[PDB]
Amino acid sequence: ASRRRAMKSATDNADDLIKALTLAANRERQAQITQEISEIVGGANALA
Amino acid sequence: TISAADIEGAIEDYVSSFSADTEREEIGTVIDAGDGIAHVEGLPSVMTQELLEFPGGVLGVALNLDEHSVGAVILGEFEKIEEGQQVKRTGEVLSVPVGDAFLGRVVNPLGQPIDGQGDIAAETRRALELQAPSVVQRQSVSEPLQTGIKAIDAMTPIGRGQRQLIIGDRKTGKTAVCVDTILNQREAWLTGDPKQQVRCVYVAIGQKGTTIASVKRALEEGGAMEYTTIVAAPASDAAGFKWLAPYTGSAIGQHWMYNGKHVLIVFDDLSKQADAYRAISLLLRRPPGREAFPGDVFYLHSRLLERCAKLSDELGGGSMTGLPIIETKANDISAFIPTNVISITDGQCFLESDLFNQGVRPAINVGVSVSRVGGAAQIKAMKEVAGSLRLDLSQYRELEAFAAFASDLDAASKAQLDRGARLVELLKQPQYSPLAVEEQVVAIFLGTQGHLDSVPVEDVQRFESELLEHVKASHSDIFDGIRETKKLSEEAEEKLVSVINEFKKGFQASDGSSVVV
Amino acid sequence: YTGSAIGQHWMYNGKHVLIVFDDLSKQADAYRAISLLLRRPPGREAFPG
Amino acid sequence: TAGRVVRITGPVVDVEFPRGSVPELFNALHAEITFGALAKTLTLEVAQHLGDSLVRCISMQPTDGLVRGVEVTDTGASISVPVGDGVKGHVFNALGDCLDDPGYGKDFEHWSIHRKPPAFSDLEPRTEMLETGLKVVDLLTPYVRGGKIALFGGAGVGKTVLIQEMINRIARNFGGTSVFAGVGERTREGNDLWVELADANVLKDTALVFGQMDEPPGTRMRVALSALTMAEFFRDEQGQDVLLFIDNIFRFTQAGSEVSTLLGRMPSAVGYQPTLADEMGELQERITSTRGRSITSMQAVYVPADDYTDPAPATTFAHLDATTELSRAVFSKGIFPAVDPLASSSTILDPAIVGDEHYRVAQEVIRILQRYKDLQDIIAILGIDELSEEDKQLVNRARRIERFLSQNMMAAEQFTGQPGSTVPLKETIEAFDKLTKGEFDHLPEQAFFLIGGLDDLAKKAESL
Amino acid sequence: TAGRVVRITGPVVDVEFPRGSVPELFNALHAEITFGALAKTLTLEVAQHLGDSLVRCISMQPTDGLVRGVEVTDTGASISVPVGDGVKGHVFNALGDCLDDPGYGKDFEHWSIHRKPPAFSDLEPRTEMLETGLKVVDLLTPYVRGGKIALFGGAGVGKTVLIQEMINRIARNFGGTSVFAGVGERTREGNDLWVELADANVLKDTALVFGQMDEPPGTRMRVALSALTMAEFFRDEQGQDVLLFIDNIFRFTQAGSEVSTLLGRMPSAVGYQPTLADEMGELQERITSTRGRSITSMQAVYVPADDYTDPAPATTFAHLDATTELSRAVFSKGIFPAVDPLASSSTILDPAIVGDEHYRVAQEVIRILQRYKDLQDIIAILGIDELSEEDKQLVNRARRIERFLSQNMMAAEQFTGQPGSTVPLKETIEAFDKLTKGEFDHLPEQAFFLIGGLDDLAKKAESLGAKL
Ligand SMILES: Nc1ncnc2c1ncn2[C@@H]1O[C@H](COP(=O)(O)OP(=O)(O)OP(=O)(O)O)[C@@H](O)[C@H]1O
Ligand SMILES: Nc1ncnc2c1ncn2[C@@H]1O[C@H](COP(=O)(O)OP(=O)(O)O)[C@@H](O)[C@H]1O
Ligand SMILES: Nc1ncnc2c1ncn2[C@@H]1O[C@H](COP(=O)(O)OP(=O)(O)O)[C@@H](O)[C@H]1O
Ligand SMILES: [Mg+2]
Numbered sequence A: 001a002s003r004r005r006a007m008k009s010a011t012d013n014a015d016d017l018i019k020a021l022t023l024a025a026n027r028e029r030q031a032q033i034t035q036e037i038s039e040i041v042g043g044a045n046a047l048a
Numbered sequence B: 001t002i003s004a005a006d007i008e009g010a011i012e013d014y015v016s017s018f019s020a021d022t023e024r025e026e027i028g029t030v031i032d033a034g035d036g037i038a039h040v041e042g043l044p045s046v047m048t049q050e051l052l053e054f055p056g057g058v059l060g061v062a063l064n065l066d067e068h069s070v071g072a073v074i075l076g077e078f079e080k081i082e083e084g085q086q087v088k089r090t091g092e093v094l095s096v097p098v099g100d101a102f103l104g105r106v107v108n109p110l111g112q113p114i115d116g117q118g119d120i121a122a123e124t125r126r127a128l129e130l131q132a133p134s135v136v137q138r139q140s141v142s143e144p145l146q147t148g149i150k151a152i153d154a155m156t157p158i159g160r161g162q163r164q165l166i167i168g169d170r171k172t173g174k175t176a177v178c179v180d181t182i183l184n185q186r187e188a189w190l191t192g193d194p195k196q197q198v199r200c201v202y203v204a205i206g207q208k209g210t211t212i213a214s215v216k217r218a219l220e221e222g223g224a225m226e227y228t229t230i231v232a233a234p235a236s237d238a239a240g241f242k243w244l245a246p247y248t249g250s251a252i253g254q255h256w257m258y259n260g261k262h263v264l265i266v267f268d269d270l271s272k273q274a275d276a277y278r279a280i281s282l283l284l285r286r287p288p289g290r291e292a293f294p295g296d297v298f299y300l301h302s303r304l305l306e307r308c309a310k311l312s313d314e315l316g317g318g319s320m321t322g323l324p325i326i327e328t329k330a331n332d333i334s335a336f337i338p339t340n341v342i343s344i345t346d347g348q349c350f351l352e353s354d355l356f357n358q359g360v361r362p363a364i365n366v367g368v369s370v371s372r373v374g375g376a377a378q379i380k381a382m383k384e385v386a387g388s389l390r391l392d393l394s395q396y397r398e399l400e401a402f403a404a405f406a407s408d409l410d411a412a413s414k415a416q417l418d419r420g421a422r423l424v425e426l427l428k429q430p431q432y433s434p435l436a437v438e439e440q441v442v443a444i445f446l447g448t449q450g451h452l453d454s455v456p457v458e459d460v461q462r463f464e465s466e467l468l469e470h471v472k473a474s475h476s477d478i479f480d481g482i483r484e485t486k487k488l489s490e491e492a493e494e495k496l497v498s499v500i501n502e503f504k505k506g507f508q509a510s511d512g513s514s515v516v517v
Numbered sequence C: 001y002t003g004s005a006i007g008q009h010w011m012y013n014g015k016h017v018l019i020v021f022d023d024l025s026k027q028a029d030a031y032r033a034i035s036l037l038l039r040r041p042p043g044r045e046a047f048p049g
Numbered sequence D: 001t002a003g004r005v006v007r008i009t010g011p012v013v014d015v016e017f018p019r020g021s022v023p024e025l026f027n028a029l030h031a032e033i034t035f036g037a038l039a040k041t042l043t044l045e046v047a048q049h050l051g052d053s054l055v056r057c058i059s060m061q062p063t064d065g066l067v068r069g070v071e072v073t074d075t076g077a078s079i080s081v082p083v084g085d086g087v088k089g090h091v092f093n094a095l096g097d098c099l100d101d102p103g104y105g106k107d108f109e110h111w112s113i114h115r116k117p118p119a120f121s122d123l124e125p126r127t128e129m130l131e132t133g134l135k136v137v138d139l140l141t142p143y144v145r146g147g148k149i150a151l152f153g154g155a156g157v158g159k160t161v162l163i164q165e166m167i168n169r170i171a172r173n174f175g176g177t178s179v180f181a182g183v184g185e186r187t188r189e190g191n192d193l194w195v196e197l198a199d200a201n202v203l204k205d206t207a208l209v210f211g212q213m214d215e216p217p218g219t220r221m222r223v224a225l226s227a228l229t230m231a232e233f234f235r236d237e238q239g240q241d242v243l244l245f246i247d248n249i250f251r252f253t254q255a256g257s258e259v260s261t262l263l264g265r266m267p268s269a270v271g272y273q274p275t276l277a278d279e280m281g282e283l284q285e286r287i288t289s290t291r292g293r294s295i296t297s298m299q300a301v302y303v304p305a306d307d308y309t310d311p312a313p314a315t316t317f318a319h320l321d322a323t324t325e326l327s328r329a330v331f332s333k334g335i336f337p338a339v340d341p342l343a344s345s346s347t348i349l350d351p352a353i354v355g356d357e358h359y360r361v362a363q364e365v366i367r368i369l370q371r372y373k374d375l376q377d378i379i380a381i382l383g384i385d386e387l388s389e390e391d392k393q394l395v396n397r398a399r400r401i402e403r404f405l406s407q408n409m410m411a412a413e414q415f416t417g418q419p420g421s422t423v424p425l426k427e428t429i430e431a432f433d434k435l436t437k438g439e440f441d442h443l444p445e446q447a448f449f450l451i452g453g454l455d456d457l458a459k460k461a462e463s464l
Numbered sequence E: 001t002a003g004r005v006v007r008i009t010g011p012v013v014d015v016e017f018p019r020g021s022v023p024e025l026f027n028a029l030h031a032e033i034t035f036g037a038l039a040k041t042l043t044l045e046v047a048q049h050l051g052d053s054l055v056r057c058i059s060m061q062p063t064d065g066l067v068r069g070v071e072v073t074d075t076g077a078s079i080s081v082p083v084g085d086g087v088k089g090h091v092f093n094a095l096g097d098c099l100d101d102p103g104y105g106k107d108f109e110h111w112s113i114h115r116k117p118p119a120f121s122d123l124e125p126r127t128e129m130l131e132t133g134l135k136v137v138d139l140l141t142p143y144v145r146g147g148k149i150a151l152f153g154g155a156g157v158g159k160t161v162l163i164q165e166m167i168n169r170i171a172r173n174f175g176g177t178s179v180f181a182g183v184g185e186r187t188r189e190g191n192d193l194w195v196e197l198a199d200a201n202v203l204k205d206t207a208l209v210f211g212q213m214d215e216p217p218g219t220r221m222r223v224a225l226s227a228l229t230m231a232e233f234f235r236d237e238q239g240q241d242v243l244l245f246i247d248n249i250f251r252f253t254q255a256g257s258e259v260s261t262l263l264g265r266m267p268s269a270v271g272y273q274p275t276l277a278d279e280m281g282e283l284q285e286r287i288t289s290t291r292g293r294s295i296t297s298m299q300a301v302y303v304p305a306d307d308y309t310d311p312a313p314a315t316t317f318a319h320l321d322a323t324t325e326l327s328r329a330v331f332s333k334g335i336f337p338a339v340d341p342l343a344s345s346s347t348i349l350d351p352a353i354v355g356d357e358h359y360r361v362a363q364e365v366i367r368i369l370q371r372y373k374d375l376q377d378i379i380a381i382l383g384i385d386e387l388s389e390e391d392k393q394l395v396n397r398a399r400r401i402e403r404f405l406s407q408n409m410m411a412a413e414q415f416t417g418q419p420g421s422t423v424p425l426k427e428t429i430e431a432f433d434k435l436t437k438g439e440f441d442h443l444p445e446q447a448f449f450l451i452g453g454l455d456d457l458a459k460k461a462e463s464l465g466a467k468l
């Protein structure tokens, strides 16, 4: 019974960690797109 | 036995009929040049996308038109361009020759042969930018296009006129799937009936020449060069050629399609074409966007891929089926070009490196792969046998976590686990070996009717193959019935079941066990 | 570069030299500032090519 | 007074006009490509005034074959689409041209596609519920009249049948009409929708406007406004309730981003256009209830990278009033419509709006379904018998509830001879209240499949 | 009829010429730096015609000391390097000057370094195995004789050590000619290679062309072309098998990107030049074997920041018959060579070419390693004791297999003090067949670390207290 309870808790914690990591990964993905666009546009403006 | 008579006659006909009467020509001057882009003053009446001639027989395409000059993408031998050179306008937008003579030939994006087999007799010419069939010029995609790959033909079936994306990381088996499809079209070709024949166009963009040669050798070994054309834009070609190669292949396929033929065109691969177009746009100083791509890259791919259509009966009923290939990086299907092409196509086959390393070949991820045409592109027999495959595989993937706890699992869960393992083994297929629709139907029938339940997983593949051999040698009437009627009749089904049971009596598991009952 | 030249004078005279750059990231930032002020087009992280 | 093409850069065209004849912003200009192969009439949309009598425009059609200096004619007004009852039953593009019958509607009244939303004082200050007649939607995810409903669902989940059902219900129950806006429409899918609507006999009640994938970004940007203008005419001049379908709104956003990039604008976060929010607001605020009539919209929404914080879905969801998620899991069970009752949601499922009894019944249904979903794993692996007796009771009740959310749809009559059913909201509320209490747990499961209210339930129970 | 310098900015120089005297693209021009300390003759490669009789060029030497308005002379031709049997046994720079014997080779035939690739009809797929004696390479990434081989990896994962190992194993007993191209790499490494080849007696059969990372971007752009021109002469004229070594080919792309923005090109994604794929395609398509003329090319490809999705390595991947991908994770685990068995690939690793046994054993090894990679996180968190018995068996087998893929290399002795070893292909296949069946499961995993064949395994196991 204790193992069942502990494994349910571990699965819930893993789900929460997955959610948080996905949020952080999406933030990083958006930031990478924004920074890449920033560098590209800066180069274009410099060559303008 | 080469007689000089033919050479003399040809050259005499050339010289005698040679006339170069002067014609008024609009001419500009190269005002600057750099890395494949030439800016040319003059040519006031030049058209957008017009073809221009530079000295030494160099070709350019006018893309940027402004008051000061014209920006032109040089299609080759750019190092020959110089400031001050005279540029003539051809008065024609990009166009390519088209005809039946292109079958079995390797050409460059301009239709010029590069295989060294001589001239190509062109039936006519097609502009690369002719509009796609209109919304009211089409009919629903209903005819199957059998790739010969069980995973695709059962899970994500492709119909004639469909655009099915093949997307995945490098070395995941995409070119293999496309080449298998082209090879599978050989029996249909041998039928000789234009309603069944499929003409194949393989467009190679950015591949190294030896890779294109290997693909051509693979096609020849299977006899696919008889009905296949290759449009090649190797890595050494100018960015303009890489940008135009898909359109050249599409134009040839469109000439065939509008004449009532059915065409299969493979773009290997559109990511390289997008990169070449991005290079051209950046060199022309066009504004960049995400990933530095221009604002019309989605337009590029969408206009390319909407020419693949199933024409209405009024227009001859022809069709062109698109198999664009996309190379993802680290399986990032969220990248810009993969996102665009996924949004454009009617279905996706996602190939994965982890599946490939696990031995699942072709490494198609059935969970995420989809075909929006769906069962409309399947024959009745495949629809019947393959109905339960999707749910069975989903349940198997759900239950895989309990592989070692089969004893704890109830009867239904263990049965589902075993069935899913056997089905996954069934969907595996060796390279360069497409299967006829009847053989695929029989194999899926084995999988989904429980006839592999008694067979060990490690033997399933072998079993299937041997069984398919046995029938083909002794009970071909089953295959003939499936092929002619496109359905599995009850009498045929019971005969197949009896044959399966006898063969099981005859079959040997690799571990010395018995597969009977 | 000044430190490298001072060390090179000894190195070419048969001596053994040890040079410590503490630290090159700051020099890279200074060079980037110089290049940007000169309006040379930027690259990754706005660094010069 | 006619202009001339000066610069051509893909779909971006610069046009020079005489000093005192510069067109207004968003005016439609006409140019001619006379090359035989690509001969056509380009429609340019004035995007910027560059100064010195120069304007920058987005070509609605590919500019291949266009020559510098060709005459450009100003039409004096922005892109205008035909309006009236004549547009029903026909297919148009973003420019108002009829695709199934070229020249049709060229004489109708023409409305500019750029219009302001209703005046702030003319807006309805109180939200209202759109009684569709479908049990699942009415009970769990009620649709807001004059609101916005996101639609989520893969292939083979009944989305097309759901759209046909909504067309039927707006045409029959509300006496309204429907405008379908295919943004970034695949030509194959557009043709399929055309033929399907013609077969189902609902084409007569629908006006189709297609901005296809193979068109430059400008038409894909403006097709939504075109369809919205047709719907606005139906609402304001004909005094009709209108149901506007947008598919896909994300493709409208992406076309806007492409246009912004083409015009040289500096991209905003994640590469979207700086005016992403402004464009989305301009489009969405025109979909409202006003003067007793309303335009209700059901829009397919694509979420990049499944990232709901992405700027495109984030801006889109600032205007959505309800969400309907179609799940293949529900579809495989035979429950139609295949609406996922747990993933779907509505912002008006609040006692202050739908009433206390409605909210209580809906919450009870959601709780039962959630507990059933939780017990699903144990059922699947350990077996049903492994569960307790209360768990078995709740499993039976939840199975009956989930099968009762299925309904016999009007659009489904074309597949099965049986016609559709319209369950009044009060009947649905009381029926599901009784069901949650376990007053029908003894009935067979099949008795709850594809039926209307309680009378149909009893009739099918006697049939078994 | 001579030009004059107008603008100078880093390695890019603008030169104005009279009417009708504008040099053709890629032409080599000469300018003088007269300052005593930095006095020299700049070679400038014409890169662009800017209009108004102006040309933008890349300097092959540092431009420090260059003065505006100095005379610029046009040679009328591209950069040309000496060709012939005389280049063997000598060290050259990108411009064809002989470093170890200045003035040598000035009378040889000279070939322009800019050249079109072989015609497509002349191309011929190569499907012949090139046995190396390295277990991982021979088993999972078999190299192709006459094909294109690359070693991918981040900084300091063993690309250069493996290049030297393959020089030791392949070039030592090679009948034909060898060409080594040091492209934007360490001068110390170049000197070490020169001395090592001299001591091994391989130098007499080798032509070395060095453009080091201290050189300006133009030299790093053109040194690969120079070495490839020498190799192309050997392939097409002398008609003998050629071994071509390039380290590091990524430096060509990097120098191109360095000068791109100064050439006025709007940057592409990740800061690379817009023409990355086209230039790389030209250079790589020149590096190939034609029908009857074999070039076995081995290239070290640097992967920036260990990011295999970076556009440079991603574009390079398409140009290789075989790729051995070195992993930082494998390196940090102490496994040498740090080959990633799951990421590497070879086009000749199919049953038709290598045979059913080799293919089956390799696929089984890959499957076991993939499963172990899948289970690593679970083992890290919950421990091995929570795995099924079959999974425990697979984990032990996979650890032994991954250790056995490591090998003591001839070129690695300087780093470990252990002499290298060579394993025949048959022995490798047999040993990994035995491993995949669990026949060595009783031996400790440490017994499989940095050894050769099965005899070495038995000896090390005995030294560790176990019997094979
Ligand atoms: N069904 C299969 N069974 C076994 N091996 C296969 C199968 N399909 C492909 N392969 C092998 O997988 C490797 C990759 O195949 P392929 O070149 O077709 O993939 P790709 O994704 O197109 O590659 P690339 O990135 O080089 O373009 C090759 O060795 C091919 O032989
Ligand atoms: N209520 C229903 N009754 C009968 N069949 C249905 C019902 N809903 C959906 N279907 C079937 O499911 C399929 C769903 O396809 P479609 O309507 O195009 O939606 P999607 O685009 O999600 O596949 C249809 O072919 C239809 O026959
Ligand atoms: N086979 C090996 N055995 C032991 N150490 C090695 C081996 N290969 C590489 N190393 C270590 O890793 C370092 C990096 O190798 P090298 O190839 O010179 O760098 P890079 O991988 O950047 O080219 C070497 O200096 C050496 O110390
Ligand atoms: Mg491929």
Ligand SMILES: [Mg+2]
Pocket: E159, E160, E161
């Ligand atoms: Mg190195």
